[PDB]
Design an enzyme around this catalytic site. Sequence first.
Site, PDB file in Angstrom:
ATOM      1  N   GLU A 174       0.516  -2.634  -1.277  1.00 20.65           N
ATOM      2  CA  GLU A 174       1.194  -2.869  -2.539  1.00 20.65           C
ATOM      3  C   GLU A 174       1.650  -1.453  -2.896  1.00 20.65           C
ATOM      4  O   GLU A 174       0.845  -0.573  -3.199  1.00 20.65           O
ATOM      5  CB  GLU A 174       0.203  -3.513  -3.501  1.00 20.65           C
ATOM      6  CG  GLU A 174      -0.347  -4.822  -2.879  1.00 20.65           C
ATOM      7  CD  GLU A 174       0.772  -5.790  -2.451  1.00 20.65           C
ATOM      8  OE1 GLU A 174       0.645  -6.489  -1.419  1.00 20.65           O
ATOM      9  OE2 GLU A 174       1.790  -5.857  -3.156  1.00 20.65           O
ATOM     10  N   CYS A 218       2.747   1.350 -11.613  1.00 24.06           N
ATOM     11  CA  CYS A 218       3.691   0.783 -10.669  1.00 24.06           C
ATOM     12  C   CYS A 218       4.549  -0.243 -11.398  1.00 24.06           C
ATOM     13  O   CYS A 218       5.605  -0.631 -10.911  1.00 24.06           O
ATOM     14  CB  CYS A 218       2.957   0.082  -9.536  1.00 24.06           C
ATOM     15  SG  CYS A 218       2.028  -1.374 -10.084  1.00 24.06           S
TER      16      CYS A 218
HETATM   17  N1  LIG Z   1       1.918  -2.213  -6.218  1.00 27.56           N
HETATM   18  C1  LIG Z   1       0.803  -1.997  -6.909  1.00 27.56           C
HETATM   19  O1  LIG Z   1       0.038  -2.909  -7.251  1.00 27.56           O
HETATM   20  C2  LIG Z   1       0.449  -0.580  -7.305  1.00 27.56           C
HETATM   21  C3  LIG Z   1      -0.515  -0.356  -8.330  1.00 27.56           C
HETATM   22  C4  LIG Z   1      -0.999   0.950  -8.581  1.00 27.56           C
HETATM   23  C5  LIG Z   1      -0.388   2.028  -7.959  1.00 27.56           C
HETATM   24  N2  LIG Z   1       0.663   1.798  -7.080  1.00 27.56           N
HETATM   25  C6  LIG Z   1       1.461   2.929  -6.501  1.00 27.56           C
HETATM   26  O2  LIG Z   1       0.592   3.946  -6.153  1.00 27.56           O
HETATM   27  C7  LIG Z   1       1.251   5.230  -6.277  1.00 27.56           C
HETATM   28  C8  LIG Z   1       0.362   6.149  -7.077  1.00 27.56           C
HETATM   29  O3  LIG Z   1      -0.913   6.263  -6.386  1.00 27.56           O
HETATM   30  P1  LIG Z   1      -1.264   7.589  -5.563  1.00 27.56           P
HETATM   31  O4  LIG Z   1      -0.482   8.769  -6.029  1.00 27.56           O
HETATM   32  O5  LIG Z   1      -2.751   7.648  -5.465  1.00 27.56           O
HETATM   33  O6  LIG Z   1      -0.707   7.131  -4.154  1.00 27.56           O
HETATM   34  P2  LIG Z   1      -0.760   7.694  -2.652  1.00 27.56           P
HETATM   35  O7  LIG Z   1       0.001   6.791  -1.745  1.00 27.56           O
HETATM   36  O8  LIG Z   1      -0.279   9.103  -2.632  1.00 27.56           O
HETATM   37  O9  LIG Z   1      -2.295   7.641  -2.211  1.00 27.56           O
HETATM   38  C9  LIG Z   1      -2.978   6.373  -2.284  1.00 27.56           C
HETATM   39  C10 LIG Z   1      -4.308   6.447  -1.552  1.00 27.56           C
HETATM   40  O10 LIG Z   1      -4.023   6.667  -0.151  1.00 27.56           O
HETATM   41  C11 LIG Z   1      -4.680   7.802   0.332  1.00 27.56           C
HETATM   42  N3  LIG Z   1      -3.768   8.370   1.327  1.00 27.56           N
HETATM   43  C12 LIG Z   1      -2.828   9.368   1.229  1.00 27.56           C
HETATM   44  N4  LIG Z   1      -2.186   9.611   2.349  1.00 27.56           N
HETATM   45  C13 LIG Z   1      -2.751   8.719   3.246  1.00 27.56           C
HETATM   46  C14 LIG Z   1      -2.522   8.435   4.634  1.00 27.56           C
HETATM   47  N5  LIG Z   1      -1.622   9.067   5.391  1.00 27.56           N
HETATM   48  N6  LIG Z   1      -3.282   7.457   5.225  1.00 27.56           N
HETATM   49  C15 LIG Z   1      -4.210   6.786   4.496  1.00 27.56           C
HETATM   50  N7  LIG Z   1      -4.504   6.956   3.194  1.00 27.56           N
HETATM   51  C16 LIG Z   1      -3.737   7.949   2.632  1.00 27.56           C
HETATM   52  C17 LIG Z   1      -4.990   8.667  -0.908  1.00 27.56           C
HETATM   53  O11 LIG Z   1      -6.048   9.572  -0.689  1.00 27.56           O
HETATM   54  C18 LIG Z   1      -5.304   7.561  -1.961  1.00 27.56           C
HETATM   55  O12 LIG Z   1      -6.616   7.026  -1.762  1.00 27.56           O
HETATM   56  C19 LIG Z   1       2.625   4.959  -6.923  1.00 27.56           C
HETATM   57  O13 LIG Z   1       3.687   4.918  -5.978  1.00 27.56           O
HETATM   58  C20 LIG Z   1       2.443   3.544  -7.500  1.00 27.56           C
HETATM   59  O14 LIG Z   1       3.631   2.810  -7.660  1.00 27.56           O
HETATM   60  C21 LIG Z   1       1.024   0.540  -6.678  1.00 27.56           C
END
Ligand SMILES: NC(=O)c1ccc[n+]([C@@H]2O[C@H](COP(=O)([O-])OP(=O)(O)OC[C@H]3O[C@@H](n4cnc5c(N)ncnc54)[C@H](O)[C@@H]3O)[C@@H](O)[C@H]2O)c1
Lengths: 516, 516, 516
Positions: free
Chosen positions: B288, B322
């Site tokens: 997501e 999001c």
């Molecule tokens: N669609 C939804 O329901 C929803 C809800 C909440 C947040 N979000 C999205 O999340 C983002 C904000 O969250 P963020 O800044 O923590 O996101 P992010 O993608 O930068 O990181 C998310 C998670 O993934 C991990 N991560 C980072 N790089 C990785 C990799 N290469 N492999 C595996 N894991 C990795 C991070 O440590 C963290 O636990 C925004 O884009 C937002 O739109 C989506």
Amino acid sequence: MTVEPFRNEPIETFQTEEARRAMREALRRVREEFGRHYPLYIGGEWVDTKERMVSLNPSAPSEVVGTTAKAGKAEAEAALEAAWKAFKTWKDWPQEDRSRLLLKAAALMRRRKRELEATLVYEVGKNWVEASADVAEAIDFIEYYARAALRYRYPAVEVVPYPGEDNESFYVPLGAGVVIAPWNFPVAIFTGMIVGPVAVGNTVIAKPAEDAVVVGAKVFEIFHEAGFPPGVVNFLPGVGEEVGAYLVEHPRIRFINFTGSLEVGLKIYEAAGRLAPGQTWFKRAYVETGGKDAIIVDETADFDLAAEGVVVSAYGFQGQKCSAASRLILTQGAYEPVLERVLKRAERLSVGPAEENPDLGPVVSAEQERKVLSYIEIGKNEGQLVLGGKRLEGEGYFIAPTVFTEVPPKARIAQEEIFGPVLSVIRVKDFAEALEVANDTPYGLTGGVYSRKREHLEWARREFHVGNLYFNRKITGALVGVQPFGGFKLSGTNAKTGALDYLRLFLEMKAVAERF
Amino acid sequence: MTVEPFRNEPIETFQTEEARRAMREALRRVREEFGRHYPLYIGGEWVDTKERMVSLNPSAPSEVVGTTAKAGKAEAEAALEAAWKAFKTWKDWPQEDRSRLLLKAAALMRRRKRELEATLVYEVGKNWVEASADVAEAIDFIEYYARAALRYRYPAVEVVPYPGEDNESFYVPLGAGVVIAPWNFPVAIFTGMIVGPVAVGNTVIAKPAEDAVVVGAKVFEIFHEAGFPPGVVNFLPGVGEEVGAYLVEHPRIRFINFTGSLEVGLKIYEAAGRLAPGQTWFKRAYVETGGKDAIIVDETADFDLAAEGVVVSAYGFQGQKCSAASRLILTQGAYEPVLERVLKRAERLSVGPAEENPDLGPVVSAEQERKVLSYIEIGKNEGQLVLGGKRLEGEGYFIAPTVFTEVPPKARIAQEEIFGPVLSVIRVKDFAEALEVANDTPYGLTGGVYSRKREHLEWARREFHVGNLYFNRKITGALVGVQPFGGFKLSGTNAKTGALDYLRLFLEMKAVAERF
Amino acid sequence: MTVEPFRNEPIETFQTEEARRAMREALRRVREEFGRHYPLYIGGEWVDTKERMVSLNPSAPSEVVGTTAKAGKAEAEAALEAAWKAFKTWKDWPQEDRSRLLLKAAALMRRRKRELEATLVYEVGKNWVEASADVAEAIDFIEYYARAALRYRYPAVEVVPYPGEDNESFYVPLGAGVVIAPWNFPVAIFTGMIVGPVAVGNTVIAKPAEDAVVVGAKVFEIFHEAGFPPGVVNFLPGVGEEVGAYLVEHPRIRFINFTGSLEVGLKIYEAAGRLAPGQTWFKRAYVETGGKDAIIVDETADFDLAAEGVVVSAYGFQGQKCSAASRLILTQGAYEPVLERVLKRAERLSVGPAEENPDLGPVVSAEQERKVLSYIEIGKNEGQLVLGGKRLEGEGYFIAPTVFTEVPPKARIAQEEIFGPVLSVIRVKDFAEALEVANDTPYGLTGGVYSRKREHLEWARREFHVGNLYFNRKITGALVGVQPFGGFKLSGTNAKTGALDYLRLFLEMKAVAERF
Ligand SMILES: NC(=O)c1ccc[n+]([C@@H]2O[C@H](COP(=O)([O-])OP(=O)(O)OC[C@H]3O[C@@H](n4cnc5c(N)ncnc54)[C@H](O)[C@@H]3O)[C@@H](O)[C@H]2O)c1
Ligand SMILES: NC(=O)c1ccc[n+]([C@@H]2O[C@H](COP(=O)([O-])OP(=O)(O)OC[C@H]3O[C@@H](n4cnc5c(N)ncnc54)[C@H](O)[C@@H]3O)[C@@H](O)[C@H]2O)c1
Ligand SMILES: NC(=O)c1ccc[n+]([C@@H]2O[C@H](COP(=O)([O-])OP(=O)(O)OC[C@H]3O[C@@H](n4cnc5c(N)ncnc54)[C@H](O)[C@@H]3O)[C@@H](O)[C@H]2O)c1
Ligand code: NA
Ligand code: NA
Ligand code: NA
């Protein structure tokens, strides 16, 4: 409901004179049309191409059963345009209207069952009953999915209410996708993978297997007569690694519905996970691959019943089934009694031209013949050949029912899908070990257990890790609606065909709230 | 059912003296707790490491809220062993037993609500109500999934019967998987993605976002107290591109449940499509991702109601959602009336330390601050800055509510997810153009329409292509059960959280037939 | 459901040559085995004894049809130990597993129907159709109870929820009990009383009637082949007042399921109410006793239809049925027309060796012959003998269809269960008096009314006090599922066999609450 409750289409046994007469008539009509050329079907019309595909009679490969047009990248693009253009309005059809269209297609197919069966006999070498079961299954998919689709109609989602608001969740189709089908069930699986997604509003570009392009064209003649709007269903016979791969990797293909070898399924699943340049969604890919299915028999079983079911499961349609019993696991007490009975039954099986309704027809092509014979050679170095293992006389690809015994659980013939009339017999100490050996393969599609001991059966129900398990009966021929079909592990993504859950795979959900 | 029908946990507004008293005490205690160290949680026990993760207070970054151990490959392997070992028995627990465990966890979380809210205030800078909504949503996920899971209990599949046979189809959990969560809803989404899969028999290795490791540990304190068996849930705070990627690419990880940025989601989905050396299944990956959500307002709407909802949707939790309204599409007749009202409301928003319960706290980190400010500089050359656009004074990462207008639909600030308090206003001719502009982005998560015209609302219900659409109300704060949450296109795989369908994603089906 | 909807097993009429050929073959096989000895069945194995029970052919008593072991106190104790040991684990089997075991038993019984029917013919003197109906009913009990048991599966109780708690109520089996069966329906009732309790988790010690020990043993051969775990079902042929009474009075027998004479049922019910030394529960005793069933016919009825139904009900299986019409109550206007027709039909009934499929075979034993002849002598002093009343020639216990007229309502032959081919005709003034006479007996099992007057039929529906009432058809042959079977007053405890309610009698309920 507005139609009678679903019932499976009876499988013709040809025990009556009328049924035999009707089949002979169909066989004659079909062969008299061996010279026919079938074009592609795009945007509601038959469109021909310069190059062509040739389909041969595996029981007499020097005899052509028909030719079809050959789709390249240009035709794939034309099909895509037509499918997306059609999706725009097809997705808005009331579900009742889409379901009625499928019901019409099912009625038309039912009226042409003998013709389709005869086409299967000549094009892919199925004997009479294997052909009838194939066509009956196709009709079942149409009838079942037509009804199942209504269970998802607007607005089908159960939600929790909230004060002062209307909260409505409902399903919508994904868009235009590609269906890539196998040659072993060229009417049933080809039909099912197409009509399921289409029933709920998606549009499809169908790519039949090279060895079954003619019967696929006849299925499309049925879709055309049924009246599916232009672009809703498209027929693109062609080379898998060419037009098939092109569509799979395309940024505008929304989903992929594939049934075939693990080798190809792995490539498709990997490609589906990539974001093609300009792609604006995460592709959904459903891949149902092969299996290395085993039937376990313990010392408490009815040995004659077991031997009969094993022979049917291992050699039906020459073992060219993802559900075929390719492994026979026998506990020490059942080994001799069962193996002896299996050998006696198997040696009485006839092999010859499919149209004469032998127990076994030929394998589908020269390529399949090469693969099967190659595995037989590998088997001679891993186990003990006790029956068959030879190519029979004639230009047709006739291979004799084969049995290897004392096969090591880790042997290549005990691990890899041969897809031919080759059974590997494995001796184990007890039921626990039988289960360990059954589970120790990269696959998990079908499995069976012959036993009178309740504790063993229920134990298998919980631990024989296969998607479709059968007790005291053959492990092939899963019936639509009765036995949701699909496996575990490298046998696929567990997309259960012939089940309510199948259609959900081709839908996405929207939740709309209005605060008054 | 053996429990009361599901009801959403009330979101505290802190208008009563009792609520304020309880919250002040919770904040004080959490503050007095700054600096505490939380270990990893593997196989039922807290396990420390030499390296650590540091969590700062975004409202005053010189303050360390707490630290946690840091998981590397060795810890990931230890968690994998514990999770798979636990799966072997956890999968056999009666569903009623697993659901009761979730209900216990929910009761424990509810009793620690103020503390968890206070931890969110300090660790990720949420004001009081935003923190309360987050925790309430977490409790809702547990309560909802505990009940939803029972709908899948053995044997739940509706099949067609067959003479002389028992045909039983049922669901079974997949195995051990990894949950990778975001920092913006570190209690709600972290909890939801974990308990959903776990409720139906799966085991999980949870990887909290780096900026929210402390609150993640507190959630695990709750899981530990609830009594989940050793290995069923594991806590692995660590670096995403390190331990997170390691698990995603591991041949022994069965599924991946991810919520985060599109950039990372794309890499995860692609990796999941690959067969790692020795892998024996097709990995399931649910991602997501973000969105670029718009609220459309036409000339028939209640402009005051719209302005209020837009400000709430755009600036709630500093626009770090999001679902946040990052685009405001106004038809010609609504442009001046709505924009002037939005500007008047937005210029009155307070910004300061989250503990003071301001309208806006700080953005979560120095890097997020840098990215948002960078997008603001980009925006200055794409549209017209009419409010904010600056970092405020203070050590905390405070950014003022920002508004750009006359923004081109294709501008970077109108297409890319900024995830900050930055609203882009787009002026269009009519409702038709409004929908065209709304749909023209790579995303499709949330959207809203303020209008009194029935035809425009129902038009949007059919054509505003987003997974969660809202009319005449804010587009954020989807409630569990009420509004299945999940988007279309590059906003994800449409895994609808807070909906019955969510659990099906973590189950596979088996069909077992016995011929009597 | 996982099996087809319940349907009653068709009762063979032997109108086809194949059916007659199959019966002759079965009769031959059965008589060729007349020398067989059948041991007891305890703890999953056949165990023999020193003393034995001898079964004779009532159509030729000098001919032995087989012998069985004879259970004494020691064997009863061994059976108890095995039953309780088995209960410990059998009670924990998932209901789906127990139901599948019954379904297997039903399939095995169905495959041996002709053999069982032929055994009934030779052992208890049933003609062909009476034998087929008996076996068909047994199969029905297994099929019906297998399905009905699933309606009680964990957790089946509907309860009111309470805040902050999980309140779960469910059923559990009682333990090990004894089944004491009659000789008149030695396959059907013997089977039903055993499989009902067993289906839901109880274990049983079955005591067949002395006159039907051989066919009871064959039923156990079926249970053995089906695979019921050791101790779940035990076979103890023996003397009722010896081993039967011993188990009834035992402190470790949890329940008693009895079908037989009122005399014995009264003793069993009384004994069941006592707390034996060391007993730790209140015993449940279900006793279905005899009846003194009447068919009322008024002047509006179809006299020919009535006469046919009366003859069938009174003389089917020589009147040895708890449901047999032993009283014919005729209103003044119907007296002559009906009596004349009944006499004409009855005098055409054949009587002879059961294997020749006569209308009437012999009564079951010398003891029954003595009782019936004794009642005939009593009848000569109470009413007027108008037909039969004599022993026919041959060593077989052949008694002629008998009719007594002008019988006083209070006469012994009009009050006491004769259990033979003896019909008592009573003349009444009107329908009201017909109902008064019908109700004035200590019994209340079956009853019938032949009339075209709606008001009389509906009046009887409300006031003819019998458990099973039939209008314008025979009053015997209640079908499983269609007509819950069981009476009122001294006809028993109203345990309705072949009905959902039957299984509840062998379960107790537990309510478990967890405050979170
Ligand atoms: N669609 C939804 O329901 C929803 C809800 C909440 C947040 N979000 C999205 O999340 C983002 C904000 O969250 P963020 O800044 O923590 O996101 P992010 O993608 O930068 O990181 C998310 C998670 O993934 C991990 N991560 C980072 N790089 C990785 C990799 N290469 N492999 C595996 N894991 C990795 C991070 O440590 C963290 O636990 C925004 O884009 C937002 O739109 C989506
Ligand atoms: N699991 C199931 O439900 C199921 C049922 C039927 C058959 N099968 C499997 O199908 C196989 C036999 O079918 P087959 O020989 O036609 O299989 P295949 O994998 O060789 O080809 C399947 C289809 O894919 C196309 N194709 C080939 N290479 C491709 C590529 N690189 N990209 C895209 N499309 C490509 C082919 O032209 C054909 O239409 C066996 O492994 C069998 O187990 C599986
Ligand atoms: N209500 C019904 O559903 C129903 C149906 C069939 C038969 N019956 C009745 O059954 C009777 C005919 O059967 P029967 O002659 O076998 O009956 P019965 O009462 O003489 O014997 C029945 C069973 O009880 C045993 N028994 C005898 N004395 C016993 C004692 N003191 N303690 C324990 N067990 C004892 C016998 O060995 C036999 O197994 C008739 O009265 C008939 O109405 C009732
Ligand atoms: Na061919
Ligand atoms: Na932090
Ligand atoms: Na006898």
